[PDB]
């Protein structure tokens, strides 16, 4: 297909947003190289940033902050590790990111990833996921994938890192249909939550194929590629919420909904793009999937789906 | 650590076996490059092997046959795609391999892998998995890993593909202990196999963390890395077995039993290294895990563990 710079010129009329997306794709390429040659002798995984040997989750953090600084179009930046925004000396967008989302899977050479969401303005609080101008994730697997969506452009677009160091468009997703595949996150809640239990028993009883790796990036990315599936992460009386709206859930909600899917956040039967983000470290629960499978989620968990039921 | 060539000079005294492992490690390096730049734009994932242009599982197939031919120490070779052995014009070893395990997850950038087992002599039938002189798997993820074990050497060894194009020893596994992590393969058999259902309900009832990706290479490799876990694939009256002993189950059984684990193959509560391989396309069922978890598998499925109970 065609290149990323060529795609961006038609997706958005904002050249600042185009420079930002270019800087995120270059940082994704460098993180992909750092993970490739990471030394995990020590159960921890190390690589060198400049003159210091830290962990992969920290080399990615510093590489993403570096890319935002030198894009000159970033006002605020915030990482999941330190959930307090920081000024990057630019202006245009505010970017929040999870540097590497795969804590218990880097040593096992599983697919891991980076999540980032882009907000316009000067605030990372008192916003919603619908105010996002762009969102994306870089997936570090056998291939290196840059999966993005821009508000001013239709669909969710996947870019492949080629041998020459450039990005090439390889798939545009605009419809997520029906199928039997599920990723049950937080299954320990099938104990204090009878609605979640009955839902999981539906999946297990209808012969849904199981695909759960523990990392959110590949578990949600597979829905966009297969154009089918359900992801669920549900809280319980004894199990507390661990996903973040700013760094993880809200950006992924845009990638999923722009590809023809739906989300159900904070147990309030609305999209994750409509849940107010009051603090950066705000937690939540979520369901991702096709419209049909999200309807079933709300019917099982709440009684009815306000948006999609009959 | 130190290199693979240096490891091999100390692991086995047979210089021909060392050349074979080197040829398999070089083929693993080349396949890792082909998967990285695969164009899954069409209905499959394609790359180049010389002039003709094929799919990735076919590019891997021809690369391993080529590596075995030009190693000069291979008598018979056999691929999962055409389960009929072929003569490679050498003499020393017979190699059976699964070129790419996980073609159903390549478009979703999940981790995939190659499996191969190395047998002495001139026949790939009327053998057992214990007669293997070496077995290994190459894991294609964010990193590229060459995981092997040799009959004449203790333990299962991990090799990381370094920046210079060489392999470096990074982890030696010799003990697989106890923990709560499971990979439930063929979960559709929990309907007409009451023992499998009771077993799966035990796993879910003890709050085991779930990690099943669909590809066996990463699902079994995580047991070796975490030194914990269970993998199960159980047949039923309505669900038939799809795993192959020669290309998949027996080599992984050596990798699993080396490093401190155990296996329970077929319906016979014995090791997979002790199951006679009569035809190349022979199918089977398996359980991989720690000695404690394999004991529980045989107790739940058959009543008692002849090797580990009491």
Planar angle of CA A66, A69, A70, nearest 5 degrees: 90
Q: Which of B32, B38, B213 sits opposite A211 (nearest CB)?
A: B213
Helix axes B216-226, B250-257, angle to 10 degrees: 10
- Are B36 and A204 within 8 A, CB to CB? no
Residue numbers in B near A223 (CB within 8 A): none
Sign for the pseudo-dihedral over CA of B152, B157, B161, B166 = negative
Cα A251 to Cα A95, A173, A194, A227, B100, distances in angstroms: 10, 16, 29, 18, 33
Residue numbers in A near B236 (CB within 8 A): none
Cα A132 to Cα A149, A281, B85, B135, B305, distances in angstroms: 10, 18, 57, 50, 57
Residue B264 phi, psi dihedral angles, 5° rounding? -135, 100
CA distance B152 to A310: 66
Q: Is A191 on the interface with B (CB under 8 A)?
A: yes
- Are A204 and B225 within 8 A, CB to CB? no
Residue of A nearest to B139 (CA): A109
Tell me the shortest Cα–Cα distance from B163 to chain A, in angstroms: 7
Residue B182 phi, psi dihedral angles, 5° rounding? -145, 155
CA distance A75 to B46: 42
Residue B82: CB partners within 8 Å, gap ≥ 6?
A: none
Q: Side-chain half-sphere of A296: how many Cα atoms within 13 Å?
A: 20
Residue numbers in A near B140 (CB within 8 A): 142
3-state secondary structure of A207: coil
**Residue ranges of B 16-35 with Cβ closer than 8 A to chain A:** 32, 35
3-state secondary structure of A2: coil
Q: Is B210 on the interface with A (CB under 8 A)?
A: yes
Q: How was this structure determined?
A: X-ray
CA distance A25 to A10: 17
Sign for the pseudo-dihedral over CA of A114, A43, A40, B118 = negative
- Are B143 and A109 within 8 A, CB to CB? yes
Tell me the shortest Cα–Cα distance from B182 to chain A, in angstroms: 11
- For chain B, the helix, strand and coil percentages under 3-state DSSP, each to the nearest 5: 35, 30, 40
Q: Name the nearest CA neighbour of A3 among A164, A138, A174, A166.
A: A166
Kindly report the number of other CB atoms within 10 A of residue B291's CB atom: 18
Q: Is A43 on the interface with B (CB under 8 A)?
A: no
Residue of B nearest to A225 (CA): B108
Contact B219, B105 (CB under 8 A): no
Q: Name the nearest CA neighbour of A250 among A74, A87, A125, A103.
A: A125
Residue numbers in B near A212 (CB within 8 A): 210-212
Residue B136: strand pairing partners? B116, B148
Q: Is B175 on the interface with A (CB under 8 A)?
A: no
CA distance B295 to B305: 6
Long-range contacts of B162-166 (CB under 8 A, 24+ apart): B162/A37, B163/A37, B165/B29, B166/B3, B166/B4
Q: Is A103 on the interface with B (CB under 8 A)?
A: no
**Residue ranges of A 107-126 with Cβ closer than 8 A to chain B:** 107-112
- Are B218 and A163 within 8 A, CB to CB? no
CA distance B2 to B22: 15
Kindly report the number of other CB atoms within 10 A of residue B250's CB atom: 32
CA dihedral of B184, B189, B195, B197, whole degrees rounded to 10: 60
Residue A270: strand pairing partners? A265
Tell me the shortest Cα–Cα distance from B14 to chain A, in angstroms: 29
Residue numbers in A near B163 (CB within 8 A): 37
Residue numbers in A near B213 (CB within 8 A): 110, 211, 213
Continuous segment of H or E residues that includes residue B64: helix B56-69
Tell me the shortest Cα–Cα distance from A69 to chain B, in angstroms: 26
Contact A141, B142 (CB under 8 A): yes
Long-range contacts of B164-170 (CB under 8 A, 24+ apart): B165/B29, B166/B3, B166/B4, B167/B3, B167/B4, B167/B25, B168/B1, B168/B2, B168/B3, B168/B4, B169/B1, B169/B2, B169/B3, B169/B4, B169/B7, B170/A39, B170/A40, B170/A41, B170/B1
* Three-state secondary structure string covering B188-222: HHCCCCHHHHHHHHHHHHCCCEECECCCHHHHHHH
- Are A213 and B214 within 8 A, CB to CB? no
CA distance A221 to B174: 35
Cα B58 to Cα B46, B54, B61, B74, B109, distances in angstroms: 9, 6, 5, 20, 18
Q: Is B166 on the interface with A (CB under 8 A)?
A: no
Q: Is A214 on the interface with B (CB under 8 A)?
A: yes
Contact A116, A133 (CB under 8 A): no
Contact A217, A115 (CB under 8 A): yes
DSSP letter, residue A108:
T
Q: Is B190 on the interface with A (CB under 8 A)?
A: yes
Tell me the shortest Cα–Cα distance from A211 to chain B, in angstroms: 5
Sign for the pseudo-dihedral over CA of A53, A55, A56, A60 = negative
Residue B11 phi, psi dihedral angles, 5° rounding? -75, -50
Sign for the pseudo-dihedral over CA of A78, A84, A90, A92 = positive
CA distance A273 to A287: 12
């Amino acid at each position: 297909g065609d290149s990323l710079a060529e795609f961006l010129v038609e997706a958005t009329p904002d050249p600042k947003l185009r420079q930002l997306m270019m800087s995120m794709a270059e940082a994704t390429r460098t993180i992909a190289h750092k993970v490739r040659t990471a030394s995990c002798a020590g159960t921890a995984c190390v690589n060198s940033f400049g003159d210091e040997q830290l962990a992969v989750d920290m080399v990615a953090d510093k590489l993403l902050f570096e890319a935002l600084k030198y894009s000159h179009v970033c006002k605020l930046a915030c990482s999941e590790e330190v959930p307090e925004p920081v000024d990057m000396g630019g202006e245009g967008f505010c970017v929040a990111f999870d540097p590497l989302d795969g804590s218990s899977i880097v040593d096992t050479n599983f697919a891991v990833g980076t999540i980032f969401g882009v907000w316009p303005g000067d605030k990372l609080t008192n916003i919603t996921g619908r105010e996002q101008v762009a969102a994306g994730m870089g997936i570090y697997g056998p291939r290196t994938v840059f999966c993005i969506a821009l508000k001013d452009a239709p669909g969710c677009h996947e870019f492949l890192l080629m041998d020459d160091g450039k990005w090439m468009h390889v798939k545009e997703t605009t419809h997520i249909g029906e199928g039997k595949m599920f990723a049950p996150g937080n299954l320990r809640a099938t104990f204090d939550n009878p609605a979640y239990e009955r839902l999981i028993n539906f999946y297990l009883g209808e012969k849904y194929t199981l695909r759960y790796t523990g990392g959110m990036v590949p578990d949600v990315f597979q829905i966009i590629v297969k154009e089918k599936g359900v992801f669920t992460n549900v809280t319980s009386p004894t199990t507390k919420a661990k996903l973040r709206i700013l760094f993880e859930v809200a950006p992924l909600a845009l990638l999923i909904e722009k590809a023809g899917g739906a989300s159900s956040c904070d147990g309030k039967a609305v999209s994750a793009l409509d849940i107010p983000i009051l603090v950066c470290d705000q937690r939540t629960q979520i369901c991702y999937g096709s419209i049909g499978e999200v309807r079933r989620f709300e019917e099982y968990m709440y009684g009815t789906s306000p948006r999609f039921s009959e």
